[PDB]
Amino acid sequence: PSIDSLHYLSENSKKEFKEELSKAGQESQKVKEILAKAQQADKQAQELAKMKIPEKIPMKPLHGPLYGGYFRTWHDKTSDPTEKDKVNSMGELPKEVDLAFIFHDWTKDYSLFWKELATKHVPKLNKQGTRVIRTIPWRFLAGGDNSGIAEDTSKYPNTPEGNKALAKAIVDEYVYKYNLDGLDVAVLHDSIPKVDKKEDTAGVERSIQVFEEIGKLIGPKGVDKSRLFIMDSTYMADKNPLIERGAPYINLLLVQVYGSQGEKGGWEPVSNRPEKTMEERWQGYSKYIRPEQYMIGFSFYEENAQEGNLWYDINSRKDEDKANGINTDITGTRAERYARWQPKTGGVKGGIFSYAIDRDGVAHQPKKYAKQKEFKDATDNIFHSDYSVSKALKTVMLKDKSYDLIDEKDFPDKALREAVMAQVGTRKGDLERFNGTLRLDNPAIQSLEGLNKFKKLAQLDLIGLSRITKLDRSVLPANMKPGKDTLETVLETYEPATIPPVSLKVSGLTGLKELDLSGFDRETLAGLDAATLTSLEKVDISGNKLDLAPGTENRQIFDTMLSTISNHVGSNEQTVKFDKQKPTGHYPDTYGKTSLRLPVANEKVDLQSQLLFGTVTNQGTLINSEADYKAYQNHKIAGRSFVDSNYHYNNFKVSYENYTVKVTDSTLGTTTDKTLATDKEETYKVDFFSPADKTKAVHTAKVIVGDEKTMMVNLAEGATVIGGSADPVNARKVFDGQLGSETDNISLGWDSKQSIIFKLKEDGLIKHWRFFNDSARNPETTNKPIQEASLQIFNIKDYNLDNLLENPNKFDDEKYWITVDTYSAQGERATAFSNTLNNITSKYWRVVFDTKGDRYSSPVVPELQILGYPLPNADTIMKTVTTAKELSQQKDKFSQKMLDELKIKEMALETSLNSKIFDVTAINANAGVLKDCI
Ligand SMILES: CC(=O)N[C@@H]1[C@@H](O)[C@H](O[C@@H]2O[C@H](CO[C@H]3O[C@H](CO)[C@@H](O)[C@H](O)[C@@H]3O[C@@H]3O[C@H](CO)[C@@H](O[C@@H]4O[C@H](CO)[C@H](O)[C@H](O)[C@H]4O)[C@H](O)[C@H]3NC(C)=O)[C@@H](O)[C@H](O[C@H]3O[C@H](CO)[C@@H](O)[C@H](O)[C@@H]3O[C@@H]3O[C@H](CO)[C@@H](O[C@@H]4O[C@H](CO)[C@H](O)[C@H](O)[C@H]4O)[C@H](O)[C@H]3NC(C)=O)[C@@H]2O)[C@@H](CO)O[C@H]1O
Ligand SMILES: [Ca+2]
Numbered sequence: 033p034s035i036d037s038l039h040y041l042s043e044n045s046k047k048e049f050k051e052e053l054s055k056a057g058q059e060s061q062k063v064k065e066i067l068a069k070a071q072q073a074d075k076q077a078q079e080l081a082k083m084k085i086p087e088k089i090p091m092k093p094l095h096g097p098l099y100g101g102y103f104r105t106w107h108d109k110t111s112d113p114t115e116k117d118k119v120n121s122m123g124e125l126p127k128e129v130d131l132a133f134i135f136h137d138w139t140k141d142y143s144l145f146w147k148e149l150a151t152k153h154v155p156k157l158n159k160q161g162t163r164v165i166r167t168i169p170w171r172f173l174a175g176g177d178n179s180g181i182a183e184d185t186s187k188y189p190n191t192p193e194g195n196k197a198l199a200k201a202i203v204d205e206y207v208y209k210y211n212l213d214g215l216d217v218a219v220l221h222d223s224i225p226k227v228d229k230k231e232d233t234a235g236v237e238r239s240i241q242v243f244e245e246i247g248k249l250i251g252p253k254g255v256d257k258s259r260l261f262i263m264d265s266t267y268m269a270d271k272n273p274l275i276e277r278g279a280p281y282i283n284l285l286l287v288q289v290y291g292s293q294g295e296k297g298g299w300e301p302v303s304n305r306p307e308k309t310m311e312e313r314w315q316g317y318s319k320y321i322r323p324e325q326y327m328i329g330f331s332f333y334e335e336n337a338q339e340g341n342l343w344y345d346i347n348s349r350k351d352e353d354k355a356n357g358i359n360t361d362i363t364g365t366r367a368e369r370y371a372r373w374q375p376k377t378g379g380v381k382g383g384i385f386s387y388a389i390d391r392d393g394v395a396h397q398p399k400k401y402a403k404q405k406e407f408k409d410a411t412d413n414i415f416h417s418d419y420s421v422s423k424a425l426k427t428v429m430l431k432d433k434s435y436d437l438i439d440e441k442d443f444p445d446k447a448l449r450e451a452v453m454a455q456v457g458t459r460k461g462d463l464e465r466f467n468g469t470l471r472l473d474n475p476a477i478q479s480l481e482g483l484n485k486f487k488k489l490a491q492l493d494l495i496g497l498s499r500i501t502k503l504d505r506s507v508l509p510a511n512m513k514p515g516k517d518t519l520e521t522v523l524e525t526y527e528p529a530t531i532p533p534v535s536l537k538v539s540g541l542t543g544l545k546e547l548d549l550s551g552f553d554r555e556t557l558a559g560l561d562a563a564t565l566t567s568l569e570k571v572d573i574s575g576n577k578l579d580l581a582p583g584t585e586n587r588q589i590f591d592t593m594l595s596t597i598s599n600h601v602g603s604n605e606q607t608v609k610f611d612k613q614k615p616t617g618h619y620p621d622t623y624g625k626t627s628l629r630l631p632v633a634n635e636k637v638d639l640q641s642q643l644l645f646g647t648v649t650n651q652g653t654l655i656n657s658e659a660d661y662k663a664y665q666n667h668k669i670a671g672r673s674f675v676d677s678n679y680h681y682n683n684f685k686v687s688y689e690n691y692t693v694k695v696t697d698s699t700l701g702t703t704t705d706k707t708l709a710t711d712k713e714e715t716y717k718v719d720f721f722s723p724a725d726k727t728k729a730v731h732t733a734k735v736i737v738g739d740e741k742t743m744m745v746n747l748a749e750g751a752t753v754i755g756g757s758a759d760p761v762n763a764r765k766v767f768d769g770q771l772g773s774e775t776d777n778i779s780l781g782w783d784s785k786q787s788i789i790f791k792l793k794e795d796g797l798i799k800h801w802r803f804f805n806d807s808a809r810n811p812e813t814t815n816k817p818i819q820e821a822s823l824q825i826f827n828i829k830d831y832n833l834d835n836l837l838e839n840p841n842k843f844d845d846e847k848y849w850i851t852v853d854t855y856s857a858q859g860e861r862a863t864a865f866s867n868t869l870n871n872i873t874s875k876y877w878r879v880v881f882d883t884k885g886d887r888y889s890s891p892v893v894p895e896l897q898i899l900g901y902p903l904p905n906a907d908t909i910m911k912t913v914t915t916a917k918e919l920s921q922q923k924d925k926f927s928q929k930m931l932d933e934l935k936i937k938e939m940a941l942e943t944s945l946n947s948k949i950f951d952v953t954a955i956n957a958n959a960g961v962l963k964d965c966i
């Protein structure tokens with residue numbers, strides 16, 4: 033009986049039986065048993081082809097806290113009847129299990145477990161209410177590495193039509209083949225599609241398309257909605273590649289959160305806080321599914337588990353009790369906390385599930401034996417479970433008020449009750465947690481009794497409710513006023529949240545007579561369409577944080593309601609109330625003081641108080657002083673003010689201490705003192721910074737003491753290094769505009785004196801220069817300071833620039849350069865040095881620094897700055913100046929009269945090059961006149 037002629041065995045099972053052939057390939061007596069079993073395996077395989085899948089028992093739709101479980105096929109006593117220690121059966125799962133997940137592995141194709149499942153387990157579990165679900169890995173929807181059916185790439189190509197063929201083939205193979213109740217797709221890192229044992233991106237993308245086609249067949253958006261379409265994952269929502277396009281097609285999301293990591297989250301010591309927490313996890317998924325579809329999972333103790341697969345989600349065997357492999361108490365377990373857990377927002381959860389439910393009741397191997405790979409504990413044997421833990425957990429949830437149905441004692445009005453259920457949910461627990469939008473626009477609503485049940489409602493739209501006549505605290509959500517979360521957590525951890533007060537939109541309540549919003553600390557009235565509240569007779573908005581100044585939207589909503597009430601019953605101290613306001617002072621988005629001009633005097637200004645100031649309400653009223661706020665307290669409505677008599681300018685004002693400052697003079701010198709001295713004529717740029725950010729400024733201003741000067745630029749930034757002893761990679765960092773961090777080595781080179789040869793970016797007129805000592809970057813730096821330095825330009829009159837450019841290193845001698853300024857440290861602590869330069873024009877430069885330290889003395893220069901203004905053709909213009917001066921001495925060639933006119937023009941040009949306001953257009957005009965006169 034060859035194995036190639038068996039017909040009914042799957043090619044996989046045949047690939048197995050022929051490998052077992054190779055072993056003992058010629059042993060006379062073992063070549064028998066392998067064929068004799070490959071046959072008996074074929075007899076079984078053909079009994080699976082001819083079994084009769086029972087007719088589907090119709091089942092009640094899902095409802096209430098659900099409890100699922102993953103039964104490991106290889107622990108069913110029919111998986112491999114030769115292993116007589118496997119005693120459990122999936123059919124024995126009690127009615128408390130709403131979802132029994134077939135979790136497949138190690139059970140042979142030809143196993144008769146599949147005939148016990150189809151013809152006995154499904155009928156039994158179905159008659160009691162338990163749905164049976166097949167679990168398949170992510171990779172079954174794409175790729176070819178263990179992709180099961182999808183390995184056949186010709187029958188199911190990766191195309192629009194191929195993906196449909198694969199989706200229908202999946203549902204047909206794994207759902208309908210045994211008349212199962214639904215399909216579960218597990219997306220983890222372990223199940224991700226691979227090829228060559230490499231994560232396949234083209235494979236992951238195909239799986240999204242195939243997942244969508246499967247959803248067009250089963251699940252809430254498929255042709256057959258009786259079958260469930262479930263997804264179980266370990267990814268956070270922001271890392272699940274299939275939730276965005278997949279979520280609308282699934283009935284339930286099962287997040288696997290085993291162990292204290294799933295519950296508490298992971299620690300991240302850079303934040304000093306936890307991440308991937310239980311609350312953070314669902315908040316991510318709350319964008320894609322309703323909370324009633326969310327199900328959190330734990331794990332029972334799997335036999336012979338090793339490091340990485342030990343979760344301790346159920347109680348552990350006591351170290352003394354060495355014979356007791358069993359523990360069925362839920363008290364103090366992670367699973368029992370998971371059953372009672374409810375998110376803080378949205379609503380209550382679908383339920384919980386357990387992995388390896390065939391191990392229900394088995395205690396956990398003590399933590400101390402985790403690393404002993406071969407230690408066989410009492411809890412590592414196989415037991416028959418009566419599923420006591422599963423029953424105990426299910427009843428815990430089933431007996432939780434959170435899942436009590438919303439009834440007429442919450443909302444006596446039917447029209448309101450039907451709308452709450454349409455938009456919020458159907459559980460009392462959903463009122464304590466729903467943080468979305470409730471739109472009550474059906475005018476049949478006769479009463480708003482019950483709305484006070486809402487604790488976290490984000491927005492409430494009351495539209496066209498003609499039968500409503502009163503609105504006050506008793507018939508509005510409880511979060512109308514600020515408050516903190518009151519739902520206590522049942523989980524473990526290592527402050528409560530703020531409840532954003534509700535946004536109240538009201539429009540078309542023509543029957544509304546009284547509006548009482550007092551004592552809620554409301555920030556605005558936005559949402560009130562006062563032009564529609566036509567029957568309003570009594571209004572009270574006192575004791576809030578409203579800015580009722582004229583011109584505001586708040587005042588106009590108020591004026592409108594006051595006008596309506598003034599045609600119905602009259603405005604008076606009883607029908608209209610508004611006082612006791614405490615508007616919230618905010619920082620402005622912008623500030624108006626963009627320039628401050630002072631005379632040159634020996635005074636002192638506080639830059640903060642003179643440029644950055646002012647508090648603004650959320651209505652846009654700017655208060656810039658204690659004087660404006662008294663004009664504000666002076667605003668009167670019906671003869672009296674609306675600001676609380678106890679709310680002073682000190683309370684309303686926003687504080688500007690902690691705000692830093694970055695002053696920059698016209699030579700690009702920098703300070704950081706709020707105090708400035710007007711003793712020196714100079715022009716400064718001032719940037720202010722909030723404590724929360726020191727890179728994006730909140731306000732820029734321009735202080736001008738005396739005659740305004742144009743601000744210089746760092747013409748050296750971006751300069752090209754072409755020489756110098758100094759390390760060219762590091763050299764170029766002196767032109768990089770920032771000082772740097774003290775992690776980066778910026779040492780120029782080995783010996784104690786180092787040059788840098790460089791060319792400026794664009795032409796320019798240079799008027800200043802500055803080099804920073806190392807103390808500018810880190811004040812505690814151990815790199816000694818520069819003792820002596822020289823800045824030089826290239827002797828272009830005598831030497832050829834082209835010779836320099838062809839062999840720039842040859843020219844590292846001061847004979848080829850001209851010195852324009854030398855620095856010599858006198859021995860005093862200096863963070864930087866700066867000095868003027870005489871309208872230099874050269875494009876090519878050479879600097880040297882010297883710490884004077886015999887050896888091991890490294891020149892460290894954060895940044896070298898050659899400052900000035902941009903000026904195209906500085907060469908020619910400055911060349912023209914020096915010509916008129918020469919001519920003016922040749923008093924024999926030119927008459928005195930010719931020279932006096934030329935002198936005025938040469939003088940005029942020099943004046944424009946050294947003017948405080950640099951004007952390139954005037955310069956060119958003068959230098960053009962001068963060259964023309966020559
Ligand atoms: C998705 C999900 O549910 N989330 C995770 C769980 O996945 C996770 O549970 C584990 O699941 C393992 C099985 O998962 C596989 O199936 C699911 C569903 O189809 C897939 O989603 C998943 O990716 C796994 O896929 C399977 O992978 C294998 C390996 O590749 C495929 O077959 C092999 O594939 C390779 C290529 O990679 C190659 O081609 C090979 O030839 C091929 O055989 C397989 O095809 C693929 N699925 C299919 C059908 O497509 C469980 O195994 C795991 O449980 C084992 O380990 C725990 C450790 O604590 C034990 O407690 C537990 O009892 C079990 O032990 C194993 O028992 C069998 C029973 O006999 C032992 O077999 C023996 O092995 C011997 C050699 O060691 C001899 O060969 C002997 O003849 C043989 O009988 C086996 O050795 C035991 N192994 C161990 C480790 O003890 C676990 O339940 C859980 C984990 O916490 O978390 C969930 O959230
Ligand atoms: Ca630098």
Ligand code: NI
Binds near residue numbers: 397405407412
């Ligand atoms: Ni062990």
